[PDB]
Amino acid sequence: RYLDYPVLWKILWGLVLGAVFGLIAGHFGYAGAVKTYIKPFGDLFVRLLKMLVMPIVLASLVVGAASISPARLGRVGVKIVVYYLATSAMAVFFGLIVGRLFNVGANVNLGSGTGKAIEAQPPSLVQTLLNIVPTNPFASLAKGEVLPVIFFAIILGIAITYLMNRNEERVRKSAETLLRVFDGLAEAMYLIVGGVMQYAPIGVFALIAYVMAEQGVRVVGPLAKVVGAVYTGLFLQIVITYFILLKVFGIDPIKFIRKAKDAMITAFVTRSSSGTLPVTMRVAEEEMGVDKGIFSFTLPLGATINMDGTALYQGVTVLFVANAIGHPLTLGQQLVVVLTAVLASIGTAGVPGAGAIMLAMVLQSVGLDLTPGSPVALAYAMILGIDAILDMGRTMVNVTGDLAGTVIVAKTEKELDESKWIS
Amino acid sequence: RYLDYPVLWKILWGLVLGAVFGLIAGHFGYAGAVKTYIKPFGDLFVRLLKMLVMPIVLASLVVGAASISPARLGRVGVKIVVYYLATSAMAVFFGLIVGRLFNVGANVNLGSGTGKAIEAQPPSLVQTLLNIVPTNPFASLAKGEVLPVIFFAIILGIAITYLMNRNEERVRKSAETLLRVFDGLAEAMYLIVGGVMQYAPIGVFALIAYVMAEQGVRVVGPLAKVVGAVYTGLFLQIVITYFILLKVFGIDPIKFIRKAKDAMITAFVTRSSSGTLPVTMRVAEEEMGVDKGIFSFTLPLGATINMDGTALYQGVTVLFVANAIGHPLTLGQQLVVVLTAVLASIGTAGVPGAGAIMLAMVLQSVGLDLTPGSPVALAYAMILGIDAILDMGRTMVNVTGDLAGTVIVAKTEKELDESKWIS
Amino acid sequence: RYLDYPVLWKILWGLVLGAVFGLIAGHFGYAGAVKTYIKPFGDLFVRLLKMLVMPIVLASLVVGAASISPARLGRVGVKIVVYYLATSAMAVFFGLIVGRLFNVGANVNLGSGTGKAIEAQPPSLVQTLLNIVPTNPFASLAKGEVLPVIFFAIILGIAITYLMNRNEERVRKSAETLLRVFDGLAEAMYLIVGGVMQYAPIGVFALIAYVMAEQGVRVVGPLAKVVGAVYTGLFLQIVITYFILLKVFGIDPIKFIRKAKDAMITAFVTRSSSGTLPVTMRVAEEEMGVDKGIFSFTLPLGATINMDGTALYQGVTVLFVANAIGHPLTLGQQLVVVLTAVLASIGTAGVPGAGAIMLAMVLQSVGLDLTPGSPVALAYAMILGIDAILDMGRTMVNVTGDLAGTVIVAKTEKELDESKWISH
Numbered sequence A, B: 001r002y003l004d005y006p007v008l009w010k011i012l013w014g015l016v017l018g019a020v021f022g023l024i025a026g027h028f029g030y031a032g033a034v035k036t037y038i039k040p041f042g043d044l045f046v047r048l049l050k051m052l053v054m055p056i057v058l059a060s061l062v063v064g065a066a067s068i069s070p071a072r073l074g075r076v077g078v079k080i081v082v083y084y085l086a087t088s089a090m091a092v093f094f095g096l097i098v099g100r101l102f103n104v105g106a107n108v109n110l111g112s113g114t115g116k117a118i119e120a121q122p123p124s125l126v127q128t129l130l131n132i133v134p135t136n137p138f139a140s141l142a143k144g145e146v147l148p149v150i151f152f153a154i155i156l157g158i159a160i161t162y163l164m165n166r167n168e169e170r171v172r173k174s175a176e177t178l179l180r181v182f183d184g185l186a187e188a189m190y191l192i193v194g195g196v197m198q199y200a201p202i203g204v205f206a207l208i209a210y211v212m213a214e215q216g217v218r219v220v221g222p223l224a225k226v227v228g229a230v231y232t233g234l235f236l237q238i239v240i241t242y243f244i245l246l247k248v249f250g251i252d253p254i255k256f257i258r259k260a261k262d263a264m265i266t267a268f269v270t271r272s273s274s275g276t277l278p279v280t281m282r283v284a285e286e287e288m289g290v291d292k293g294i295f296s297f298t299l300p301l302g303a304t305i306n307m308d309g310t311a312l313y314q315g316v317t318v319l320f321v322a323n324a325i326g327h328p329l330t331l332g333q334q335l336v337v338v339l340t341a342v343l344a345s346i347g348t349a350g351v352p353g354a355g356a357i358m359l360a361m362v363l364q365s366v367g368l369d370l371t372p373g374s375p376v377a378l379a380y381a382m383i384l385g386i387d388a389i390l391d392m393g394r395t396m397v398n399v400t401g402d403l404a405g406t407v408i409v410a411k412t413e414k415e416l417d418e419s420k421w422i423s
Numbered sequence C: 001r002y003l004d005y006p007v008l009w010k011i012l013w014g015l016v017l018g019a020v021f022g023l024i025a026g027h028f029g030y031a032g033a034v035k036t037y038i039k040p041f042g043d044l045f046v047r048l049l050k051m052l053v054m055p056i057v058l059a060s061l062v063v064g065a066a067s068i069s070p071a072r073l074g075r076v077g078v079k080i081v082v083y084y085l086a087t088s089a090m091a092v093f094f095g096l097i098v099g100r101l102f103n104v105g106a107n108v109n110l111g112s113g114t115g116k117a118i119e120a121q122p123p124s125l126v127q128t129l130l131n132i133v134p135t136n137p138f139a140s141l142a143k144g145e146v147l148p149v150i151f152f153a154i155i156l157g158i159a160i161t162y163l164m165n166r167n168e169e170r171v172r173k174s175a176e177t178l179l180r181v182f183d184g185l186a187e188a189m190y191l192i193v194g195g196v197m198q199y200a201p202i203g204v205f206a207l208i209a210y211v212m213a214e215q216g217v218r219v220v221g222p223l224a225k226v227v228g229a230v231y232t233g234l235f236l237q238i239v240i241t242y243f244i245l246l247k248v249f250g251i252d253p254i255k256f257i258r259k260a261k262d263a264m265i266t267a268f269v270t271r272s273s274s275g276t277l278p279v280t281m282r283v284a285e286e287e288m289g290v291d292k293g294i295f296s297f298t299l300p301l302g303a304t305i306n307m308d309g310t311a312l313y314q315g316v317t318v319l320f321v322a323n324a325i326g327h328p329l330t331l332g333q334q335l336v337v338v339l340t341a342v343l344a345s346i347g348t349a350g351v352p353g354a355g356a357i358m359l360a361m362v363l364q365s366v367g368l369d370l371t372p373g374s375p376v377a378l379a380y381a382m383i384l385g386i387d388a389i390l391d392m393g394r395t396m397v398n399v400t401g402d403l404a405g406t407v408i409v410a411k412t413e414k415e416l417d418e419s420k421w422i423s424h
């Protein structure tokens, strides 16, 4: 009966009300009630979005790659990958700066030795890259492996267009029927996304409420300085790095944020950027006028290998652990941090649990090892204690970057529909 | 050269001849010979039907949900879910009455104390409900999970019609092609079902022969009284609850039974209600003139959450165990049994191995705990010795109940083709 | 600068140069460099082909089985199954003969008793056949199970044609839309196969280089005599068994080999006959003019259950193991070897790891049990040390056999497009 009220204001209301409710409920210790009675609605939201990810990516990308020439596709890939690597480097640098500014971990005062022992491996760059090519697309679809689905969909769309420009008519009509099936399937997926966003304010309320209820009490002391530094840094990544790059390429930054708000809040509360994809792709299509041939490729690629927020978070936690055990990082060490954070975004691309794998990687890069019972393990466990509060903002900036790079690359390909940007 | 003989007579011939053959073979100790040389033909039958179950459900429901309004679909869902719960409670009630009538387990005379060991909880009501929404539909498909497939199929068909009512013609043609692909897939599945029913008499013979050969010798003494009670009770659920409910809503009970006979025998020999689905849906369409938009939703839902036969069986075996250890159940305990049996059919919806889980739930509700080496454990182990003999009948009544509810709901929606019911 | 160069010359160049590069690199011990820097390009080739296998099999067979009568489908199946069994028995027989000729394992001189404790057992034939019928075709697709996919695809195509010959227009239009979705999918797949064959010279070079670099050093002494015996036997299976059967049914054997070349080299370096399937089928369609209704059924079936090369290898290795432990095989024991090798091709149909399982079966059939630490176990490990050098050749002859039988059945069904066999 509440469907008639506008949706976007509803999602903002749910964000604020779930936040206030969760703080008030967890401060009085009723956070277990929140986990039991409030959370499953946010879980329902998250499952409803996650359901759409595999069909909408596959279908949108067959369609888009078909509707575009391979030369342009390759050009878009080169552009978006450069944009991604550059923005990740910027975000590590920002995390380093805001951490040094907030002087994070300076008052934990742990005594620490000089011992160093490795934990996880980087999956070999060669094996990860080879793993981009699926050996069974039905299996990748069933397993939800995004990158090989991207690869298979691109190949299929390119094949479909080559077949449609052939002389035999049976060939054209077959390929055309196939492309119709993908086109209808993607059309339906975006329809359902719009339907689920009707339920979205409830889920936003529930997710933000549970995260504030379980982890609000923990935002005090040195971890409070961590939360403040991380969130200020994310804010800087948005209002400086994104606004300036959007301003250079002639996109009004405020119009961009106003349009992106739904994808942003969905990322902020589901803490899954892949599970925000249906909202992100529909936002790119029906708000920013990006052509399917751009966003249907850049946005899943970006959910997988483009996490500015995570990079900034790594920049803060390396400072936190280093200052916490008493060995602040030398300039060259911070350069090593930036370099390895970007290389680690590439190296763990698509690997499950790559969050902790990259963090172990960066820490290992400057000589901070997670040996059990050591002070470094202790400080890292300190951070993981507020990892969810951080995950909200981290995921939000991860998705927002994807949208900003998609709009920039599109404007540079004249595949951006200007009619949506007129006041 | 045998195909020419009519199918229905062939299936009856296979049923009766397999029963007599299996009894004669288990009496002469050749039941292992039956397991080795006769059984694989029935296994072949079962594999051929189970092969069709996933595609036919996915496609028939995309199509059906497209051909119907969401308001009507929801109305049908409420009708069938009410019908399901009501007939399930009735079946527990009948099992209790037929159990008291046969005085089941009265002469086992096991001594059992007043000792009580606390056990684990039943699978969560909330998580099974959330499990209805898939997080990857390709994955639910690969795993054979019916309920998430129903959910995805309904969402997809609804999206498809809303797309077919758009102004742009490319969108309509895309959606129309997608629907054509699903319509062809469903037509082919039903074609194949009819082909498999030609091989059905052989497999029916083999399955009934293996079950009689392995478990004929065990229908003696107290377990024979159990078999008599359970089969009498199922017969009552059919001839009282189903016939009275069909007469109340104006469906000829005898024509119903005659049309459902193929689904009935198939369920009785395969003891899997989910695997009789292709035959059941074919009977709903090409024998009872039920509209696809009703049965394509109610019949898979019914295979999953509507087991009158299992409910009656639980009523009989809970009385059997209570009498065998020497503590007959008080009236309020039997009420607790009925309430718990229905709620446990809901709570275990789609859960693998849900049969024993429901039985454990019902037993624990009245304080008969299955501690190993206890007399209660012994009584349950007695019953399991005849589980196949019982499984035939209870699966049969499970599926027949599904059909009766589909025909009644269709009749109330004027979605029932009256021409198939006049001679 | 690459694509314009002719294709056949490039793949042969990559094969010869990769082999010489790998020998020279492993003969000087740089095989670790090859495994690290050269191998991953060949791995990329193998994955690119493996990707296409499930889609192309499903789609080609829905389309093909629709485009053919069920009576003809059955006739083709019986023909190709007889051909497969006969050519397999011939291959075990040839392996025995070339083994006797090279006197394989004759100078290993291990002492062996006559006690044998049963360790292996056969996987049930009945369950192996029943597994042909999938119980979830989406699951068989996701698990990469070929044989049950074949079954589902044939059922679906047959249903589709029966629907397309019905009175209602809506049903025809539905079934035909479905058939076109599969036809479009298959057309795209073959398009992609041809595209991937552009990278083939690199990947062929890399695979052959890695195998030569890891295993060249081991082709000396008794295992060298094994390599010579096996490759001679494979060559004979091609030049006698295949050439005579093609000549008998009126197919020019030289035209045949010239056409099969891509499938042959691809099978030879990837050592996966199922994973060579996309190249084999594109060669059958776009080189030999076999109708989709023949090859879309016979080639994946043969990739799964028809291994002339593996059978010849078993023929050689059983004589090798027997001579190596000092108990040469009786004539009737050799007949049991042939009979069980053929039966073991069926009994493991689609079973994972069926290579070693068939070898264990054939060994056990003549009383050589692979109990750990026994001398028979030791001789088997000797053989396994060169399994890659042997896998190249036996996979090549496996696939070549599939092609030859497909073309013969096609000639007998007048489903072979003779215009592809006229030279100017």
Ligand SMILES: CCCCCCCCCCO[C@@H]1O[C@H](CO)[C@@H](O[C@H]2O[C@H](CO)[C@@H](O)[C@H](O)[C@H]2O)[C@H](O)[C@H]1O
Pocket: A187, A190, A191, A192, A194, A195, A196, A198, A199, A286
């Ligand atoms: C207690 C909460 C329970 C809520 C669950 C019920 C969901 C009901 C859906 C109502 O919301 C609408 O759904 C449409 C899709 O069904 C969307 O159409 C949208 O989707 C199309 C995409 O094809 C766009 O082109 C259209 O512009 C656009 O109106 C539309 O935005 C949205 O308002």
Ligand SMILES: CCCCCCCCCCO[C@@H]1O[C@H](CO)[C@@H](O[C@H]2O[C@H](CO)[C@@H](O)[C@H](O)[C@H]2O)[C@H](O)[C@H]1O
Pocket: B003, B190, B191, B192, B194, B195, B196, B198, B199
């Ligand atoms: C593993 C190998 C096992 C081998 C088993 C043998 C396979 C069966 C051979 C085919 O037999 C025919 O198949 C038709 C398929 O259509 C059936 O028509 C059925 O389907 C159509 C429904 O539209 C209608 O023609 C009829 O109502 C209905 O009899 C029909 O009964 C039957 O004569």
Ligand SMILES: CCCCCCCCCCO[C@@H]1O[C@H](CO)[C@@H](O[C@H]2O[C@H](CO)[C@@H](O)[C@H](O)[C@H]2O)[C@H](O)[C@H]1O
Pocket: A162, C003, C187, C190, C191, C192, C194, C195, C196, C198, C199
């Ligand atoms: C990791 C990156 C790997 C990328 C793979 C390399 C791409 C190579 C560039 C494209 O080369 C062409 O691509 C076509 C396929 O797209 C092929 O068409 C072929 O396929 C058709 C099949 O329908 C035939 O009819 C045509 O004659 C035939 O030219 C063609 O041979 C090939 O020269």
Ligand SMILES: COc1ccc(NNc2ccc(CO[C@H](C(=O)O)[C@H](N)C(=O)O)cc2)cc1
Pocket: A271, A272, A273, A274, A307, A309, A310, A313, A351, A352, A353, A354, A355, A391, A394, A395, A398
């Ligand atoms: C339940 O067991 C498992 C199993 C696997 C997993 N994760 N795999 C994975 C991979 C990448 C990330 C990046 O993370 C972002 C962040 O944290 O900054 C943020 N969450 C976002 O989506 O952008 C995170 C996780 C997690 C739990």
Ligand SMILES: COc1ccc(NNc2ccc(CO[C@H](C(=O)O)[C@H](N)C(=O)O)cc2)cc1
Pocket: B271, B272, B273, B274, B307, B309, B310, B350, B351, B352, B353, B354, B355, B391, B394, B395, B398, B399
């Ligand atoms: C490996 O085999 C499997 C595979 C999956 C499962 N889980 N799903 C499930 C859920 C409920 C039942 C109740 O069963 C009915 C009965 O006994 O009254 C009768 N069989 C029937 O279908 O109406 C039976 C199974 C169980 C066994």
Ligand SMILES: COc1ccc(NNc2ccc(CO[C@H](C(=O)O)[C@H](N)C(=O)O)cc2)cc1
Pocket: C271, C272, C273, C274, C307, C309, C310, C351, C352, C353, C354, C355, C391, C394, C395, C398
């Ligand atoms: C995808 O990962 C996998 C999946 C499966 C496996 N093993 N299963 C298997 C391996 C080989 C064969 C027959 O072997 C042939 C031979 O050597 O003679 C030769 N290799 C050929 O291709 O014809 C039969 C079954 C290994 C890795």
Ligand code: NA
Pocket: A083, A084, A085, A086, A087, A088, A089, A306, A307, A308, A401
């Ligand atoms: Na980035």
Ligand code: NA
Pocket: A271, A272, A273, A274, A275
């Ligand atoms: Na994610």
Ligand code: NA
Pocket: A273, A302, A303, A304, A305, A306, A307, A308, A398, A399, A402
């Ligand atoms: Na991202």
Ligand code: NA
Pocket: B083, B084, B085, B086, B087, B088, B089, B091, B306, B307, B308, B401
């Ligand atoms: Na019921």
Ligand code: NA
Pocket: B271, B272, B273, B274, B275
């Ligand atoms: Na079942």
Ligand code: NA
Pocket: B273, B302, B303, B304, B305, B306, B307, B398, B399, B401, B402
């Ligand atoms: Na049922």
Ligand code: NA
Pocket: C083, C084, C085, C086, C087, C088, C089, C306, C307, C308, C401
């Ligand atoms: Na053969």
Ligand code: NA
Pocket: C271, C272, C273, C274, C275
């Ligand atoms: Na293989």
Ligand code: NA
Pocket: C273, C302, C303, C304, C305, C306, C307, C308, C398, C399, C401, C402
């Ligand atoms: Na083969």
